[PDB]
Amino acid sequence: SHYTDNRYKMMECIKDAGRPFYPHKFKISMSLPAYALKYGNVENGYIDKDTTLSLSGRVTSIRSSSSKLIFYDIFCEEQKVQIIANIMEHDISTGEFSVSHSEIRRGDVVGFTGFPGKSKRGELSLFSKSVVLLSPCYHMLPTAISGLKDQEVRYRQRYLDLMLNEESRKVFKLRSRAIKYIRNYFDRLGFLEVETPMLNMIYGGAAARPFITYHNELETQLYMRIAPELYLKQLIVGGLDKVYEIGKNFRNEGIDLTHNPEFTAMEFYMAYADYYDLMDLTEELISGLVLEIHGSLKIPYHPDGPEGKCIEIDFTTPWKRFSFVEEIESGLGEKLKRPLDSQENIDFMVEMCEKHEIELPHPRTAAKLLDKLAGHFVETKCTNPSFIIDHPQTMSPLAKWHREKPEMTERFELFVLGKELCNAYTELNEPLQQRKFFEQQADAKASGDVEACPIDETFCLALEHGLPPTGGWGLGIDRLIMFLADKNNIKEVILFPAMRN
Amino acid sequence: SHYTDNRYKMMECIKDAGRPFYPHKFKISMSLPAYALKYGNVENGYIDKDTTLSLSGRVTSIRSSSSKLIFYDIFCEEQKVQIIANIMEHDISTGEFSVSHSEIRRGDVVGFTGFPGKSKRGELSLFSKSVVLLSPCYHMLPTAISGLKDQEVRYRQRYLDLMLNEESRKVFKLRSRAIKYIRNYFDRLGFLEVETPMLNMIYGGAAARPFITYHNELETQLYMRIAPELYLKQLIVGGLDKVYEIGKNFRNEGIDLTHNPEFTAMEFYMAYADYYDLMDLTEELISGLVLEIHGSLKIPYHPDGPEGKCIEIDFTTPWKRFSFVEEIESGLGEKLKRPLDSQENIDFMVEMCEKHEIELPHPRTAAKLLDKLAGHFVETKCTNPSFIIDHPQTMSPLAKWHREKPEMTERFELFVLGKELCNAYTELNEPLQQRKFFEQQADAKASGDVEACPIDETFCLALEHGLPPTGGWGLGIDRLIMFLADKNNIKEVILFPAMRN
């Protein structure tokens, strides 16, 4: 583009001519919001020539009325302000009027000095005496996001989106608000925030494939964490009683509308809680947050974008419970075979997958067959926030056995609109079984399950030091933001999401 | 150890005998702190047989004073409570007294039921009627950390440290407190907290060697971030005006008393600030925090451990400023040669390193020679919090040129006791020079500097959209905690630090 070359040329001319070239410091008198608060209610035509103010922003508009009168719009911190540059007021010590204003283009970051007030037409304005070019824009911008080559530019160059699109800026403000709310909830319960390692010698705590890396000086290979769970439980052994962590997990898997290779998770571990206690807590925390944000527990969601259909999601507590196996058996019209991890049941589940046209997993472990069936028959029933509960042990290697139900565990997942938000259980604290389930997992891994985790002997050793009865819990913050902010694409709620190259 | 085998054997016997085996849920009447608050001031010998309470904790002591009377200490949430188990009071429906208490060992997590009050000797106590084994400890514990095989166990098995050492628990409480204080500081200034990616296609923003990894589905190699700087500055282009991030950096380098391959950094970017503004902010923030924690700006530090010498560090503002080159030239007793990146000056600086017995760097870039000299002559003068300022451009590729001093930049580092805490500058916002400095860096990388960063074209493109005059800043949280908590080893302030294997 000729535009970019010419701008570099202009800037060189400016520098060689000793005119202001990327000034180090511009001292604003106040923010534009603070300016609008102070002068926004004056009478039309008001002007205070006894007050000289410095304002700065990005130029969004340039209109000349004549050779002697120029109108700018500047924008900063969510506030627009009009600048009215009259040659009569121009401070000649900063250069000839025409020269000073010839250096300014739309998109430029500029400073102005002058007198506060309002135009006769009633527009909040600064009656300028000078202009300074602080940081030029070397590209022709559109006036809105619809003027971009394509809408993927919004993600590859988020600065453009944030520049031009208020709706985008609002998502990240809301993200901050929601996380404050969540921290505060747990802070008031006497929780302690902790940081456990993102570099792991052994990955674990989730069904996910890891990123791999290497620490050269210590000549050891490492994994990025898929979850902090195995570390956090050790803190409960250590007696910290109530801990939470909020931070990135890394999952080496495909991207789509609800997946990004890194995302923000929260986990908490609470000693002496069980999964029943955690369901109540989840309801209180999430319903509270929804209410804080929306003023109501019934909120809009647009699955197919903002001009498509609108459904209502009802966060009124208590939420529906679906029992994992029973709901699968309702869909099937007959019972799964027992034991659930028997060859008999693996075969049966394969048969049922073919019959109901469900894509089979690989490998064909009982765990992954159960997961496919739950995805078809149960997750699809979860429009309003719903708990799927009482997952089989065979797919729940870190969850404590159900106190009433054989083969099951004290686990729940929270689904909203068929997407998983939370995953929680009464924590397994018996090390003999834990070692056994880790072995079954390593066996699955060797059989080609890329989401099965290796044995962690250090974790087993920690359990041998006595983990109190404990309840644990994780939440995908980003998917939560998708619901609160009404977005159907993860890329909307992460500043710099991953993209195909 | 026979002990571990026998405990597994006991637990099997318990299960086969139908006795309580890892109960799922134990409902406490109140916390131990709450128990101490309620019954701590009763008269000696008080007992309320009309109130039955459930308490739980980890057993820290077992004294059988006779065949009929056992004294336990349990500990939980920073509170010890004595249990007095009299055969006279035992609920026989839970088993024979001797049988019930034979299942309990030091280190066990246990529940007790009984009557609140105080012993005749005046010890806060529960007069128990039952005991439940909730989670046994299968290993013989010491009573304090000095009873561990070696003191590195504290780090390889942090649960033991946290179990046994109050001072350890205090560090991580203080860590949480300090980060709350810091977030609050910036929150009240109208900052927005953000998350930028830890998986990067191009690493940048610091002198550090990166971890390397690979995203299989997108068939692309990735770096873990060494700093969020290049992303964060794009948010200022986008107009967010004030942003901070608190989160892990990853640096693939050797470990020692002040280095860990991952650590917690905070960066913030404030539009319209310069490095002068940032020095004032740093003083206010850190002096405030010190005062909050210590009740004074003068605090103790033990560089050689708790039985060694003690220095006093004085955080009284304003802090000393040392000009980088001038202080080096004072130490040398002559001037560096100009330009600073000339072959003449490289040679000179090599000569001076040999003369003053300073370990040479590899490769021998001007930047790294300057660093070694600053390490010898300037960093060593920084006992009390001190700013080193006005670093050469050649070692400061993202810092804006000094407005007065040729070849220098508007940068500072904050040092306390010769260790770096902060690094900050008036941000370079001129894309022509930025591209040039990135080229010099890539050239250094190709010459074998593993801490030099490649060119980031996407960042250059962002600068071409106009970065406002901006001030940026980073802080090593963990090193700060070392000073606040008086620890001379990074491993003290990170829950699960890296270890040689």
Ligand SMILES: Nc1nc2c(c(C(F)(F)F)n1)C(=O)N(C[C@@H]1CCC[C@H](C(F)(F)F)C1)C2
């Ligand atoms: N690759 C990937 N994987 C997951 C998620 C994401 C993303 F970007 F959408 F945020 N990307 C997510 O939100 N997930 C829900 C899980 C539901 C249960 C709790 C966990 C937890 F604990 F990690 F937060 C997340 C998976």
Ligand SMILES: Nc1nc2c(c(C(F)(F)F)n1)C(=O)N(C[C@@H]1CCC[C@H](C(F)(F)F)C1)C2
């Ligand atoms: N490998 C490594 N490197 C650094 C640090 C650490 C550790 F473990 F101590 F935390 N380990 C640290 O604290 N560093 C100070 C820097 C001082 C200036 C600001 C930066 C920043 F940006 F990361 F905050 C940290 C380096």
Ligand SMILES: N[C@@H](CCCC[NH3+])C(=O)O
């Ligand atoms: N680690 C789980 C969340 C916590 C489960 C309960 N301990 C996950 O990533 O899904």
Ligand SMILES: N[C@@H](CCCC[NH3+])C(=O)O
């Ligand atoms: N990225 C720097 C901190 C910020 C420097 C100022 N932009 C570091 O890691 O030391």
